[PDB]
Design a protein around this ligand. Structure first.
Ligand code: SF4
Ligand code: SF4
Ligand code: SF4
Ligand SMILES: [Zn+2]
Lengths: 182, 374, 67, 89, 186, 130, 89, 118, 209, 114
C-alpha cells in the first residue's frame, strides 16, 4: 500500500505532465509516436458511447447517471442504442442463462476497441443470487470485464467515477508507441 | 422500451403485429427457492429487489405478511412513517412509469425534468435508510429505525415545489396533440375483459372499476387520511396516463395529512422477541443481548400457517402468499406481481395495432421487470 | 490533470459530502489516535495494487521423513 | 443577493414564458434544514413500563391457534354473504 | 365549466367526465387551436423559458455530494481507542449476512484472546445491506462511507482482513464522526 | 366402462428419466435415510422427531486463490424431511435413487428415577453430596 | 520485494518455493503495520480497589457490552472483549 | 336516462325490466329440473324470487337499482346470465351428490413431516 | 389492552364463517373440508376432480361472485403421498372479500385447467408446469415460461439442489456458450437453524390424525 | 400392487407407442431444417444418429404414464426447435462437447482422484 505525498513533497515535485507516457522520449520516431498515441487516446477518451444494456434494478442508476444531477454527456458520454455504434457496454443486472448467449452475441457484434464495465454486484460476481440454478455466477464467465463498479446498486457517483477510471485506462493505453517495438 | 429484459417474438404482415408471443423469463433468478433457504429477516431484501422501481411498498407487503402470521401490531408513529414512504414510493414509481413511457413515445424533456425531482426523493430515502434505493427500512416490527430530525421539513419543501414541477410537464404533455393521438384509443380494455384476466391497479381503476385496495381493504394508516382516487371511463392508454397523473396529485395531499399529524412515541413493535432490541439496551441488559443474539443468528419462529396479503403498490395489487412451517425459515414464498397478468393480456391487447402502438402499450402496462420473472 | 475522486482525505471527506457541518478546522472532537494511516488513492491497475491472499496458516501438517 | 438567479430581465421573460409565477427549485443551505442537529432521544415505550408488564399476558405468537373446521364447529353446536356489498359497479 | 357525463360520489374523481362543449365559441376555440397550434406554442415557449433555469449538474469530482451519515459503502474493521482489533469473531455478522459474503475463522492468539485469523468479504457478493454492522455486538465492522472503490480486476475485490483493517485505519476519523452521530439514535 | 378414464397401473412407478437428475448422480450416489442426530449439549428434543434423507459427501478442496472450501458436487447440501421412514423409502424409490435406511432407536425403556434412592440406609446409591 | 516476505500477524509467509507466491509478481502483498498483540501489550494494566471492576472497553454504547471482572486473584485479569488489563494490588 | 354506464364495453341497455324478468324466468326453470333435495336449489329460488319479486314494484330503473342493491342494472343482468350458465352446467355437474373422494390421511395436515404416537 | 397484539375483524370472521358453511353444503360432492385460518382468510379444500366446478361455482353464483383469480400458487410437500399442492386465491369485488381454494396432486396424474374458467390463469398454469411439472389437462399451450430452453427438471421442487446441476460458460474452441457440470468457488454453506425447544405448544397435539 | 388412477393421454401401451412414434416422425422430418436454420457444425446424419440414441436413452421405460410424459417433453422440444426459439448453444447441448469423457476404468479413476 502507498499513500499520497505530503505538502512539502508536493512542493519539490514538478508538474505531473499530461500524457501519462511522459516526455522522456529519446528519438524523433519515439517522440512522434508518443504524440499520436496521445491524440488517439484523447479521442477515444473524450467521446465514449455506452450501449445501455441495463437489465434490471441496476439499470435505474444507469438512468440516473443520464439524469441531470451527475450529468454524463457533460463528460462526452452518449447512449447510442445500436451496438454497431456503441463503444462501451455497461452490463448491469443479473445474467441469467437465457441471457448469457444474448450478452455474448451483443458483445462481439460490437466492434472494438470495446471496454466493458461490470456495474453492480449482480454482474460482478452474480451478486445476491450467486447460488442460484439459473444465474451466471458473475459476468466474467461470458465476457472480458474491464472495470468493476461495486455496489448494490452503486450510487450514481460511484458509477461515473468508474467511468472516469475507464477514461484513465483509455488514456494510458499504448498502441502506436509500442507497436514501434513490436 | 423493452425494459432491457422482455423478448417479444412477433410475426408481422406489412407493419402490423399479428402474433405477439412474449418470452417472460429472461430475468428469472430463482428467488422463490433462495427465499426458502434463508431466514425471514435475511429474506427481506429479496422483496425490495422485486419490482425494483417500487422500493418501500414491496417491503411493506412482506412486513405485513409476517405481522399477520406473528399476530403483532406496530405503533402509530411506525404506521405513519410507513404510510409516508408508501406514497413517496408511489410518486417515485409513477415518475418512472411516466418517464419511461415518454421515451417509449419519444419525448426526452419530460423524462429529464422529472428525473431531476426523482433525485430529491431518493436523497430522502438515503437520509432515512442509508441507501439510495434498496433500503431495508420497513421491517416486521415496524420500520427498522427512527427518522433523522429535520427530514420532516425537507419533505415539506419538496412537496411544496412538486406541484410546480408536475404541472410544468403536465401542461406540456397532457394536451399535446402528438401525445394525445399517439396514446389515445390504444388497446381498449373493456371492464369484463379486465376482470376475467385478473387485472388491478390503475389499469383496472382506469377501465372504470371503482376498486382499490387502500379504500376497501385498508392495511396501513390510510384509515386516518381522506382523499379520492382517480378513475377513467375510456380504458385508453391516455386516460390511464391521466389517472396516474392525478394519482401523483392525490398522493401529495396524503403526505399533507400524514406529515401534519405525525405523533410521537416508539418506532417499533414492543415485542423484543420479534424485532431486535436497541444497541443501548443491548450492551447493558442480559436478555436484550440474548434476544439480539438469537434474532440475528436464528431469527424468530413464526407460528405454522399459510397467509396471503396484498397492498396497493403503484403497479397494482402486489401480493405475497407466504407459508410458514413453524420454524424460523419460510417454507414457501410465492409472489404475485401485477405485471404478470398485465402482460399476459398483451397477446390479446396488441392484436392488429401498429408496431408503434405495441411499444406504447408495453409502456402503459408499466410492467417493470424482476417482479414478473424471479 | 490526474485529479481523482479519492484524493479527498478522511477528516475532510464528511464535510465535502455535506455529511458533517463541522469543518475539521473547527471540531477537534474527532479522534486523534496514533495508528491512523495517511490517505491513499484507488491504487488499481498499478504495481501498488492490492491483491488478495489466504489469511489462514495451512491446516494439516505433513509427516517429515527426516525426523 | 440570496440565490444565484439569472439577471432580472431574463427572470421576467422566464415568468412570462412559463405562464405561472415561478418558484426556485435548486436547494440552498439556507432553504434546507439546519444540516447539523442536536442528538435525538427516542421516548421509551409503553411495554417498557416497569411493572405489571408480564410477557406471558401480552404475547401474540403464543396466542394464535390452528385453523378451525367450520362444519365440525357446527357439530359442536338473510342469505349469508362474504361481506358488505360493495358497489364496484 | 361543462357539466359532467357520469355523476360521481365522493372518494373518487373521474378524470374524463367533463364534456366537450358544442357551443360555437367553444368549437371555434378548438378549431383555432388546431389551425395555429396554440397548444404547441404553449409547450414551445415553456422549453424556451426553461433554458433560463440554471442546470443542477454537480461538477464531479470537484463538487460532489450530498450523502447522509448512514450511507452504506466500503467496509472497514475498526479498532479500539487503544488500537486493538474490535472484532472478537462472534460470527454473528456471517450468520446474518444475507448474501453469505462473509467467511470467518477464529482461534486464540498467544495472549489467549478470542480473535479472528481469516476475515473475508466478497464485495461481488455483498449487497451493502448493512445487516452485518447492525448485528455486530461491538461495532467491529461498519459500512464505511467510501464508495469510489472501483477495480480493474475481479480478484482485487475479494477483501481479506488485511485489506479491511487498512480501510479502517484509513477512514477511522470519518467513521468515528458518523457513529457519534448515530449511536444513540440507531 | 370408465371412471373419467381411470387406469390400472402399478403403484411403484420409477420416475428417474422424467425427473431430470443426471444419471451420473443417480448411478454413483446413495441416500442415507435416518433421523438427525441429537445435539450433545442440548436438552430440547423437538428437532429430532422427523425422518431425514441426504446424500453422501463427495469431496471438498480449497480454492487455490482465496482458500475457500470449493466443492463441485451439487447434491451436497441437499436435505429433505419426512414423517416416517416408510414414507421416505416410498419417495426415494419413486425418484429412482439408491438408499439404505439407518434404524433410529428402540422405544426408551422406562427408568425408575426415584428421588428417595438419593437417601438410603443400606443401598450404595446414597448421594455423596447434594 | 519485502511485501512478499513479511509475516502476517496471523502467521503466514508463502514458502520460498511456493507457486502461490506468483500472484504478487505484479501486485503488493498488503500486511498491516499495527499488530494488536503488541499494542495491547504496551497499554499498562489499570488498577483499582474494589474486588470487582467493570469494563466496557470503549465508552457508553460505543464500546463492548459491560462486563464485570473480579480481581481477587493475585495476577492480572484481561477483559474478555477489549483486552484491557486489570490488577488489584 | 343515464348517459353512460361509467364502464367501457358495458353499454346502457333499455327494457331492463323485460330482460331481467326473462332471465329470472329461465333460471327458475333451470333450477326446476334440479332434484328437490339440493342445497343449491333450495337457496336459488328464494334468492332469485326475491330479486324477481323486487323487479316489479319499482318501474323507475334507478328506483329498482336502489331496491335491489348489489350494483347497477347493466351489470346486474350479466349476473343473471352468468347464473343461467351456472344452472345448465350445475345440472350437468350433479354436485348435490355426496363425497366423490376422501382425502388420504395426513393430506391436509400442517405442519408436515412430524412423527406421531400410534 | 395489548397494543402489540392485533385484533382481527370479528364481524368479518362472522360473515366468512357462515358463508363457508354455505359453500360446503352447496357442493357436497367436491368440497372435502372448509376451514377458517386464524388470519381471517377462508380456505376451501377440494378433491382434484372438482377444481373447475368449484371455480365455476364461485365466479358465477350470486353469493360468491368471485371473479378475479389472483394466482395459482404451487406448494411442494414430500411425505404426502400425492404431494404437489395447488392454491387458487380468489377475490370478490361485489362483496369485498377474499377466498382460497386448494387441491392436491402427485407428480404424475394430470390436473384440471382453469384456462376455460378464468382467462387470467393461462400463464399461471404454464408457470407451475415449468416450476413443478404439474401437468394441466385441456390447457391450450403448456409451453415453459421462466426456465431457459432445454432445461431439465423443475427447480421449485424441494428435492432439487439449490444451485442446479449445470452452469454455463463460454468456449473459444467453439465460439459458443456451453453448459458444464456444476463447480462452485465456495460451496454454499448452510446453517442448521433448528429449534431444540418447542416454542409453540398450541399446535402440538392439535391437528392430529 | 396396482392403483386405479387417472390417465394423462394414452390409455394403453400401444397408444403410447403411437404417440411416441408420431413424435419420432416430427423430429426426423425436422432435422434438415435445423441443419439449415441453426448455423452449427452438426450435419444431418449425426443429428439423425443422435436422435436414435436419444430415444434409446430410455428403452426400458415401462409405465404407460411415464412414457406419456416423455412424449410430452418431446413434443415441447420439437416445437422449440421447429420454431427457432432455441439458440445454437441450446440445440448443440445434446452433445456435451465442453467436457472430455471422464476416465472410467478403475486405475484412471484411481490415478485421477475421486
Ligand atoms: S447488484 Fe444490487 S442493484 Fe444491481 S441488479 Fe443486483 S440487487 Fe439490483
Ligand atoms: S459480528 Fe463483529 S465481532 Fe462478531 S465476528 Fe463479525 S465483525 Fe467480529
Ligand atoms: S452489507 Fe449485508 S450483504 Fe454485505 S457483508 Fe454486510 S450483511 Fe453481508
Ligand atoms: Zn473491556
Amino acid at each position: 500500500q502507498q499513500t499520497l505525498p505530503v505538502a512539502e513533497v508536493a512542493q519539490n515535485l514538478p508538474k505531473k505532465g499530461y500524457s501519462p507516457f511522459g516526455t522522456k522520449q529519446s528519438s524523433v520516431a519515439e517522440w512522434s509516436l508518443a504524440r499520436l498515441d496521445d491524440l488517439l487516446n484523447w479521442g477515444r477518451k473524450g467521446s465514449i458511447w455506452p450501449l445501455t444494456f441495463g437489465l434490471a434494478c441496476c439499470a435505474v442508476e444507469m438512468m440516473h447517471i443520464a439524469a441531470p444531477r451527475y450529468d454524463m454527456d457533460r463528460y462526452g458520454v452518449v447512449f447510442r442504442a445500436s451496438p454497431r455504434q456503441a463503444d462501451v457496454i455497461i452490463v448491469a443486472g443479473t445474467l441469467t442463462n437465457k441471457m448469457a448467449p444474448a450478452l455474448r452475441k451483443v458483445y462481439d457484434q460490437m466492434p472494438e476497441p470495446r471496454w466493458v464495465i461490470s456495474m453492480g454486484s449482480c454482474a460482478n460476481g452474480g451478486g445476491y443470487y450467486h447460488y442460484s440454478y439459473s444465474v451466471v455466477r458473475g459476468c466474467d464467465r461470458i465476457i472480458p470485464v474491464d472495470i468493476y463498479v461495486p455496489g448494490c446498486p452503486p450510487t450514481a457517483e460511484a458509477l461515473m467515477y468508474g467511468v472516469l477510471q475507464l477514461q484513465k485506462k483509455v488514456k494510458r493505453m499504448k498502441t502506436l508507441q509500442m507497436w514501434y517495438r513490436k | 422500451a423493452a425494459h432491457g429484459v422482455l423478448r417479444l417474438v412477433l410475426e408481422l404482415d406489412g407493419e402490423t403485429v399479428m402474433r405477439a408471443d412474449p418470452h417472460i423469463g429472461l430475468l428469472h433468478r430463482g428467488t422463490e427457492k433462495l427465499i426458502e433457504y434463508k431466514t425471514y429477516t435475511q429474506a427481506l431484501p429479496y422483496f425490495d429487489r422485486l419490482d425494483y422501481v417500487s422500493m418501500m411498498c414491496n417491503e411493506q407487503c412482506y412486513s405485513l405478511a409476517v405481522e399477520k402470521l406473528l399476530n403483532i401490531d406496530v405503533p402509530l408513529r411506525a404506521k405513519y412513517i410507513r404510510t409516508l414512504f408508501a406514497e413517496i414510493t408511489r410518486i417515485l414509481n409513477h415518475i418512472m412509469a411516466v418517464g419511461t413511457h415518454a421515451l417509449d413515445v419519444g419525448a426526452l424533456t419530460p423524462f429529464f425534468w422529472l428525473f431531476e425531482e426523482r433525485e430529491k426523493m431518493m436523497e430522502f430515502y438515503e437520509r432515512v435508510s442509508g441507501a439510495r434505493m434498496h433500503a431495508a427500512y420497513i421491517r416486521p416490527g415496524g420500520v427498522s429505525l427512527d427518522m433523522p430530525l429535520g427530514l420532516m421539513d425537507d419533505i415539506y419543501e419538496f412537496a411544496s415545489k412538486f406541484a410546480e414541477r408536475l404541472d410544468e410537464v403536465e401542461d406540456v404533455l397532457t394536451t399535446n396533440r402528438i401525445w394525445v393521438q399517439r396514446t389515445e384509443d390504444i388497446g381498449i380494455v373493456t371492464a369484463e375483459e379486465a376482470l376475467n384476466y385478473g387485472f388491478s391497479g390503475v389499469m383496472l381503476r382506469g377501465s372504470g372499476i371503482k376498486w382499490d385496495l387502500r379504500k376497501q381493504q385498508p392495511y396501513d394508516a390510510y384509515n386516518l387520511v381522506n382523499f379520492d382516487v382517480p378513475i377513467g371511463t375510456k380504458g385508453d392508454c391516455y386516460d390511464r396516463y391521466l389517472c396516474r397523473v392525478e394519482e401523483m396529485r392525490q398522493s401529495l395531499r396524503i403526505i399533507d395529512q400524514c406529515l401534519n399529524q405525525m405523533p410521537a412515541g416508539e418506532i417499533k413493535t414492543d415485542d423484543a422477541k420479534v424485532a431486535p432490541p436497541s444497541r443501548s439496551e443491548m450492551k447493558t441488559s442480559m436478555e436484550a443481548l440474548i434476544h439480539h443474539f438469537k434474532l440475528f443468528t436464528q431469527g424468530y419462529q413464526v407460528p405454522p400457517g399459510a397467509t396471503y396479503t396484498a397492498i396497493e403498490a403503484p403497479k397494482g395489487e402486489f401480493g405475497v402468499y407466504l407459508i410458514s412451517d413453524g420454524s424460523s425459515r419460510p417454507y414457501r414464498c410465492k409472489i404475485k406481481a401485477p405485471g404478470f397478468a398485465h402482460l399476459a393480456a398483451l397477446e390479446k391487447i396488441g392484436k392488429q395495432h401498429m408496431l408503434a402502438d405495441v411499444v406504447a402499450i408495453i409502456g402503459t402496462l408499466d410492467v417493470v421487470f424482476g417482479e414478473i420473472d424471479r | 490533470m490526474d485529479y481523482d475522486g479519492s484524493m479527498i482525505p478522511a477528516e475532510w471527506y464528511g464535510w465535502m459530502h455535506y455529511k458533517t457541518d463541522l469543518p475539521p478546522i473547527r471540531d477537534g472532537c474527532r479522534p486523534k489516535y496514533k495508528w491512523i494511516a495517511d490517505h491513499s488513492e484507488n491504487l488499481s491497475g498499478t504495481k501498488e495494487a492490492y491483491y488478495p491472499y489466504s489469511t489462514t496458516p495451512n491446516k494439516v501438517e505433513a509427516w517429515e521423513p527426516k525426523a | 443577493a440570496l440565490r444565484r438567479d439569472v439577471s432580472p430581465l431574463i427572470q421576467r421573460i422566464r415568468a412570462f414564458l412559463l405562464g405561472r409565477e415561478h418558484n426556485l427549485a435548486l436547494r440552498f443551505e439556507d432553504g434546507l434544514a439546519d444540516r447539523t442537529q442536536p442528538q435525538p432521544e427516542i421516548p421509551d415505550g409503553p411495554s417498557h413500563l416497569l411493572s405489571a408488564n408480564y410477557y406471558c399476558q401480552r404475547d401474540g405468537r403464543r396466542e394464535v391457534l390452528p385453523p378451525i373446521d367450520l362444519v365440525e364447529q357446527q357439530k359442536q353446536l338473510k342469505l349469508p354473504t362474504p361481506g358488505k356489498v360493495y358497489a364496484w359497479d | 365549466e361543462p357539466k359532467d357525463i357520469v355523476e360521481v360520489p365522493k372518494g373518487y374523481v373521474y378524470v374524463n367526465n367533463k364534456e366537450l362543449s358544442m357551443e360555437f365559441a367553444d368549437i371555434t376555440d378548438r378549431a383555432a387551436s388546431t389551425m395555429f397550434f396554440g397548444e404547441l406554442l404553449r409547450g414551445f415557449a415553456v422549453t424556451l423559458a426553461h433554458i433560463f433555469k440554471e442546470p443542477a449538474t454537480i461538477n464531479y469530482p470537484f463538487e460532489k455530494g450530498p450523502l447522509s451519515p448512514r450511507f452504506r459503502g466500503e467496509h472497514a474493521l475498526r479498532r479500539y481507542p487503544s488500537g486493538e482489533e474490535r472484532c472478537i469473531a462472534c460470527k454473528l455478522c456471517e450468520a446474518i449476512c444475507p448474501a453469505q459474503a462473509i467467511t470467518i475463522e477464529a482461534e486464540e492468539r498467544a495472549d489467549g484472546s478470542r480473535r479472528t485469523t481469516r476475515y473475508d468479504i466478497d464485495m461481488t457478493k455483498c449487497i451493502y445491506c448493512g445487516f452485518c454492522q447492525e448485528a455486530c455486538p461491538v461495532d467491529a465492522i461498519v459500512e464505511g462511507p467510501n464508495f469510489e472503490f472501483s477495480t480493474e480486476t475481479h480478484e482485487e475485490l475479494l477483501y481479506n482482513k488485511e485489506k479491511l483493517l487498512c480501510n479502517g485505519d484509513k477512514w477511522e476519523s470519518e467513521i468515528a464522526s458518523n457513529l457519534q452521530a448515530d449511536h444513540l439514535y440507531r | 366402462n370408465k371412471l373419467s378414464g381411470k387406469i390400472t397401473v402399478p403403484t411403484a412407478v420409477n420416475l428417474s428419466p422424467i425427473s431430470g437428475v443426471p444419471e451420473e448422480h443417480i448411478r454413483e450416489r446413495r441416500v442415507r435415510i435416518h433421523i438427525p442426530p441429537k445435539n450433545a449439549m442440548q436438552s430440547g428434543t423437538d428437532n429430532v422427531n422427523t425422518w431425514q434423507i441426504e446424500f453422501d459427501n463427495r469431496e471438498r478442496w480449497e480454492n487455490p486463490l482465496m482458500g475457500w472450501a470449493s466443492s463441485g458436487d451439487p447434491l451436497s447440501n441437499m436435505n429433505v424431511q419426512f414423517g416416517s421412514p416408510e414414507e421416505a423409502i416410498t419417495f426415494c424409490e419413486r425418484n429412482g435413487w439408491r438408499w439404505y435406511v439407518d434404524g433410529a432407536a428402540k422405544p426408551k425403556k422406562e427408568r425408575v428415577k426415584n428421588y428417595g434412592i438419593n437417601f438410603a440406609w443400606n443401598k450404595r446409591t446414597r448421594v455423596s453430596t447434594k | 520485494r519485502g511485501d512478499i516476505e513479511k509475516v502476517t500477524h496471523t502467521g503466514q509467509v508463502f514458502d520460498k518455493e511456493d507457486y502461490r507466491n506468483a500472484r504478487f509478481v505484479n501486485a503488493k502483498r498488503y500486511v498491516n503495520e499495527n499488530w494488536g498483540i503488541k499494542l495491547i501489550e504496551e497499554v499498562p494494566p489499570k488498577e483499582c480497589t474494589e474486588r470487582v471492576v467493570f469494563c466496557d472497553g470503549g465508552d457508553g454504547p460505543l464500546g463492548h457490552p459491560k462486563v464485570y471482572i473480579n480481581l481477587d486473584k493475585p495476577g492480572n485479569h484481561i477483559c474478555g472483549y477489549c483486552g484491557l488489563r486489570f490488577v488489584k494490588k | 336516462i343515464k348517459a353512460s354506464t361509467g364502464l367501457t364495453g358495458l353499454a346502457v341497455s333499455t327494457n331492463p325490466h323485460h330482460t331481467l324478468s326473462a332471465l329470472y324466468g329461465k333460471i327458475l326453470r333451470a333450477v326446476s329440473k334440479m332434484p328437490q333435495d339440493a342445497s343449491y336449489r333450495k337457496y336459488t329460488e328464494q334468492l332469485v324470487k326475491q330479486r324477481a319479486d323486487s323487479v316489479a314494484q319499482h318501474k323507475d330503473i334507478t328506483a329498482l337499482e336502489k331496491a335491489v342493491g348489489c350494483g347497477q342494472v347493466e351489470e346486474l343482468i350479466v349476473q343473471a346470465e352468468n347464473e343461467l350458465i351456472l344452472a345448465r352446467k350445475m345440472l350437468g355437474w350433479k354436485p348435490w351428490e355426496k363425497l366423490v373422494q376422501a382425502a388420504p390421511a395426513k393430506q391436509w395436515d400442517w405442519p408436515p413431516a412430524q412423527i406421531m404416537e400410534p | 389492552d395489548k397494543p402489540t397484539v392485533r385484533q382481527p375483524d370479528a364481524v368479518a370472521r362472522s360473515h366468512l364463517s357462515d358463508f363457508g358453511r354455505y359453500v360446503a353444503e352447496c357442493l357436497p360432492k367436491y368440497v372435502q373440508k372448509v376451514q377458517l385460518t386464524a388470519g381471517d382468510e377462508l380456505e376451501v379444500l377440494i378433491a382434484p376432480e372438482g377444481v373447475v366446478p368449484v371455480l365455476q361455482f364461485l365466479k358465477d353464483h350470486h353469493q360468491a361472485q368471485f371473479t378475479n383469480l389472483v394466482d395459482i400458487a404451487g406448494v411442494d410437500v414430500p411425505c404426502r403421498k400425492n404431494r404437489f399442492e395447488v392454491v387458487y386465491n380468489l377475490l370478490s369485488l361485489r362483496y369485498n372479500s377474499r377466498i382460497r381454494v386448494k387441491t392436491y396432486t402427485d407428480e404424475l396424474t394430470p390436473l384440471d385447467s382453469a384456462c376455460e374458467v378464468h382467462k387470467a390463469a393461462n400463464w399461471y398454469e404454464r408457470e407451475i408446469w415449468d416450476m413443478y411439472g404439474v401437468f394441466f389437462a385441456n390447457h391450450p399451450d403448456l409451453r415453459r415460461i421462466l426456465t431457459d430452453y432445454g432445461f431439465e427438471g423443475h427447480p421449485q421442487r424441494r428435492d432439487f439442489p439449490l444451485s442446479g446441476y449445470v452452469e454455463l460458460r463460454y468456449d473459444d474452441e467453439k465460439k459458443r456458450v456451453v453448459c458444464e457440470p456444476l463447480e462452485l468457488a465456495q460451496e454454499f454453506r448452510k446453517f442448521d437453524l433448528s429449534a431444540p425447544w418447542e416454542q409453540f405448544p398450541n399446535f402440538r397435539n392439535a391437528n392430529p390424525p | 400392487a396396482v392403483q386405479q388412477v387417472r390417465p394423462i393421454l394414452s390409455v394403453d401401451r400401444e397408444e403410447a407407442r403411437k404417440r411416441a412414434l408420431n413424435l419420432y416422425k416430427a423430429w426426423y422430418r425436422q432435422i434438415p431444417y435445423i441443419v439449415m436454420d441453426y448455423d452449427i457444425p452438426m450435419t444431418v446424419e449425426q443429428c439423425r444418429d443422435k436422435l436414435r440414441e436419444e430415444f434409446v436413452k430410455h428403452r426400458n421405460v415401462t409405465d404407460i404414464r411415464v412414457i406419456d410424459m416423455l412424449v410430452i417433453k418431446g413434443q415441447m422440444e420439437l416445437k422449440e426447435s421447429v420454431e427457432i426459439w432455441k439458440q445454437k448453444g441450446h440445440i448443440m447441448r445434446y452433445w456435451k462437447e465442453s467436457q472430455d469423457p471422464k476416465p472410467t476404468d478403475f486405475l484412471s479413476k484411481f490415478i485421477q482422484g475421486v
